[PDB]
Scaffold this active site. Structure first.
Site, mmCIF file in Angstrom:
data_model
loop_
_atom_site.group_PDB
_atom_site.id
_atom_site.type_symbol
_atom_site.label_atom_id
_atom_site.label_comp_id
_atom_site.label_asym_id
_atom_site.label_seq_id
_atom_site.Cartn_x
_atom_site.Cartn_y
_atom_site.Cartn_z
ATOM 1 N N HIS A 1 0.848 -1.190 0.000
ATOM 2 C CA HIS A 1 0.000 0.000 0.000
ATOM 3 C C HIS A 1 0.888 1.246 0.000
ATOM 4 O O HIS A 1 2.092 1.153 0.220
ATOM 5 C CB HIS A 1 -0.864 0.004 1.262
ATOM 6 C CG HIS A 1 -0.063 -0.041 2.523
ATOM 7 N ND1 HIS A 1 0.632 1.049 3.000
ATOM 8 C CD2 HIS A 1 0.250 -1.072 3.344
ATOM 9 C CE1 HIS A 1 1.345 0.692 4.053
ATOM 10 N NE2 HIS A 1 1.132 -0.591 4.283
ATOM 11 N N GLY A 2 0.301 2.413 -0.237
ATOM 12 C CA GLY A 2 1.091 3.634 -0.222
ATOM 13 C C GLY A 2 1.250 4.150 1.202
ATOM 14 O O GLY A 2 0.263 4.253 1.930
ATOM 15 N N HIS B 1 3.034 -5.023 3.219
ATOM 16 C CA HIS B 1 3.622 -3.779 3.688
ATOM 17 C C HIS B 1 5.089 -3.730 3.298
ATOM 18 O O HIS B 1 5.582 -4.610 2.594
ATOM 19 C CB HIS B 1 3.454 -3.679 5.205
ATOM 20 C CG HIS B 1 2.025 -3.777 5.651
ATOM 21 N ND1 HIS B 1 1.238 -2.668 5.885
ATOM 22 C CD2 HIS B 1 1.232 -4.856 5.873
ATOM 23 C CE1 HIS B 1 0.024 -3.058 6.235
ATOM 24 N NE2 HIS B 1 -0.006 -4.382 6.237
ATOM 25 N N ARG C 1 -4.994 -0.978 6.294
ATOM 26 C CA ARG C 1 -4.463 -0.322 5.099
ATOM 27 C C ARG C 1 -4.114 -1.371 4.034
ATOM 28 O O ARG C 1 -4.207 -1.118 2.833
ATOM 29 C CB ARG C 1 -3.240 0.531 5.447
ATOM 30 C CG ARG C 1 -2.129 -0.167 6.219
ATOM 31 C CD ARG C 1 -1.056 0.864 6.554
ATOM 32 N NE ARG C 1 0.093 0.340 7.292
ATOM 33 C CZ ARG C 1 0.078 -0.022 8.571
ATOM 34 N NH1 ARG C 1 -1.039 0.065 9.297
ATOM 35 N NH2 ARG C 1 1.206 -0.450 9.131
ATOM 36 N N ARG D 1 13.477 10.179 13.416
ATOM 37 C CA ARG D 1 14.877 9.767 13.524
ATOM 38 C C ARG D 1 15.596 10.409 14.719
ATOM 39 O O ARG D 1 16.325 9.729 15.456
ATOM 40 C CB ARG D 1 15.625 10.087 12.224
ATOM 41 C CG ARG D 1 16.819 9.165 11.925
ATOM 42 C CD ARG D 1 17.460 9.554 10.588
ATOM 43 N NE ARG D 1 18.385 8.553 10.051
ATOM 44 C CZ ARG D 1 19.064 8.694 8.908
ATOM 45 N NH1 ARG D 1 18.928 9.799 8.178
ATOM 46 N NH2 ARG D 1 19.872 7.727 8.485
ATOM 47 N N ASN E 1 8.125 -4.111 5.002
ATOM 48 C CA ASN E 1 8.941 -5.225 5.453
ATOM 49 C C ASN E 1 8.347 -6.575 5.118
ATOM 50 O O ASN E 1 9.073 -7.524 4.839
ATOM 51 C CB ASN E 1 9.165 -5.091 6.946
ATOM 52 C CG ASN E 1 9.972 -3.882 7.277
ATOM 53 O OD1 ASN E 1 11.178 -3.869 7.070
ATOM 54 N ND2 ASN E 1 9.312 -2.837 7.761
ATOM 55 N N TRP F 1 2.619 9.672 8.557
ATOM 56 C CA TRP F 1 3.724 9.345 9.451
ATOM 57 C C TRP F 1 5.006 9.077 8.696
ATOM 58 O O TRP F 1 6.072 9.521 9.106
ATOM 59 C CB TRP F 1 3.387 8.118 10.293
ATOM 60 C CG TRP F 1 2.810 8.445 11.622
ATOM 61 C CD1 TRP F 1 2.095 9.563 11.960
ATOM 62 C CD2 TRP F 1 2.841 7.619 12.789
ATOM 63 N NE1 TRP F 1 1.678 9.479 13.269
ATOM 64 C CE2 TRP F 1 2.123 8.295 13.800
ATOM 65 C CE3 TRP F 1 3.403 6.369 13.079
ATOM 66 C CZ2 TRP F 1 1.954 7.760 15.081
ATOM 67 C CZ3 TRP F 1 3.234 5.837 14.355
ATOM 68 C CH2 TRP F 1 2.515 6.533 15.338
ATOM 69 N N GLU G 1 3.097 -5.445 8.907
ATOM 70 C CA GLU G 1 4.318 -4.688 8.703
ATOM 71 C C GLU G 1 5.235 -5.067 9.860
ATOM 72 O O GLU G 1 4.807 -5.684 10.834
ATOM 73 C CB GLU G 1 4.026 -3.179 8.734
ATOM 74 C CG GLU G 1 5.239 -2.287 9.004
ATOM 75 C CD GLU G 1 6.289 -2.319 7.890
ATOM 76 O OE1 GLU G 1 6.657 -3.420 7.412
ATOM 77 O OE2 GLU G 1 6.763 -1.227 7.503
ATOM 78 N N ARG G 2 6.501 -4.698 9.741
ATOM 79 C CA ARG G 2 7.489 -4.988 10.768
ATOM 80 C C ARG G 2 7.129 -4.279 12.065
ATOM 81 O O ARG G 2 6.719 -3.118 12.051
ATOM 82 C CB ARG G 2 8.866 -4.522 10.298
ATOM 83 C CG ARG G 2 9.936 -4.539 11.355
ATOM 84 C CD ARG G 2 11.237 -3.973 10.798
ATOM 85 N NE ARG G 2 12.281 -3.931 11.819
ATOM 86 C CZ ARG G 2 13.435 -3.287 11.683
ATOM 87 N NH1 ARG G 2 13.693 -2.631 10.562
ATOM 88 N NH2 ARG G 2 14.323 -3.290 12.673
#
Lengths: 249, 249
Positions: free
Chosen positions: A10-11, A187, A61, A99, A189, A15, A88-89
């Protein structure tokens, strides 16, 4: 190739833009992400793809992306099957932070591994985390093939591949070997981990693989379900290079 | 009672106002038909309904109705399962035609039966009907529990109940007895046939039951999966009459 399977992701949303990881937070697709799913369905219809079965994750999603593609294909009747092993992961305690916030609370040196390595697991998400409750209170995680307490609290790409494999081997592969055309709505990952396995990519190279969103990723598999040659992105080269450029860095 | 089950039907289309039977023609919900699905989902959310499983037919109007409700409930992860045995009644060669046309080809007295009777089967659809191919060329019917050539070519309300029962008994009943909260997105006759069976309604009394669309139909079942009272319509008691009175005209 004796078999052909399609996969895509998915796009990413708001976030991702702020360089934050949605991870297991069940955020819905935004306007842009819903457009990708549609255009992707149109792209598949244009290639006359006929799916017999669909696999998605438990995150909405992933599912909504699949629904929009089926509607575009006029194949809303195709069985859809969801599993957390396609989630997802799980970024653990790093869920939500950007970050800079990560380096501050954990150490720059320490943060490097967690996002750029294949086997270093980020610290576990804890009761005190802002999103801890929202994830584990959800009753979708109370009906998985493993009890709630036995689920991941954080993961490395290696971890992801390890809980995904069981699902590929036990549920998805048998269907490919049975002659079915499968679609996998995954997703970042999730799709990355499955490609490593099917294409036999090393622990060092898996990290640098490009994975554009909203793009159909065709995989041609032999009798052992091992990818014959490189996976191919389906669609016009312009749309592809823009999507590729978007998942850069 | 000990068990619970929610059923409902999709909003009717243009054909239904023209007094035509969409039947097995796979028409999409119109603007009106989609708002009902949403409002219905909002009504269920308002009632804090948590479904564990969902059953629909193979006709996309049935499916999309379910998707819109799951989205409103934030339960897109709930497994969805589709079957033709949940399909709308097959009206045979009467598919498409309007009241004036049916009479013109069969007879006011003969057509009065096919629409108001419980066991008189309309004539089968012939390979020359305008909508034959559109229905039997479709691949969704080349993967049913019975070969394409063995599917009904027309049906009575009784016929509908007889190809629906196997699916209730074998697939849905077991899940109810297993403690699961089920949701059934059906059609006019599909939902009608099911209520008749579970509530033990006569062939004469069945014809008159009022089945509003876009409305949650709660059924409380005992240990034998028999109705413990009459089914009940849920939601704003205001909007419920808007549903019945509309169905009664």
């Amino acid at each position: 190739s004796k078999y052909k399977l399609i996969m895509l992701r998915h796009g990413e949303g708001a976030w991702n833009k702020e360089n934050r990881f949605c991870s297991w937070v069940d955020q819905k697709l935004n306007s842009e992400g819903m457009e990708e799913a549609r255009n992707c369905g149109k792209q598949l219809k244009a290639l006359n793809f006929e799916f017999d079965l669909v696999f998605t994750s438990v995150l909405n999603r992933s599912i909504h992306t699949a629904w929009l593609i089926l509607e575009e294909l006029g194949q809303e009747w195709v069985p859809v099957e969801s599993s957390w092993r396609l989630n997802e992961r799980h970024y653990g305690a790093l869920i939500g932070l950007n970050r800079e916030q990560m380096a501050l609370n954990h150490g720059e040196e320490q943060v490097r591994l967690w996002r750029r390595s294949y086997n270093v697991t980020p610290p576990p998400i804890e009761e005190s985390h802002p999103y801890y409750q929202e994830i584990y209170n959800d009753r979708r995680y109370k009906v998985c093939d493993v009890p709630l307490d036995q689920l991941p609290r954080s993961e490395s790409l290696k971890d992801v591949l390890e809980r995904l494999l069981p699902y590929w081997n036990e549920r998805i592969a048998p269907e490919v070997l049975r002659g079915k055309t499968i679609l996998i709505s995954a997703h970042g990952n999730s799709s990355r981990a499955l490609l490593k396995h099917l294409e036999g990519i090393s622990d060092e190279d898996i990290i640098n693989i490009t994975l554009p969103t909203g793009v159909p990723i065709l995989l041609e598999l032999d009798e052992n379900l091992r990818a014959v040659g490189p996976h191919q992105f389906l669609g016009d080269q312009e749309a592809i290079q823009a999507a590729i450029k978007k998942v850069e860095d």
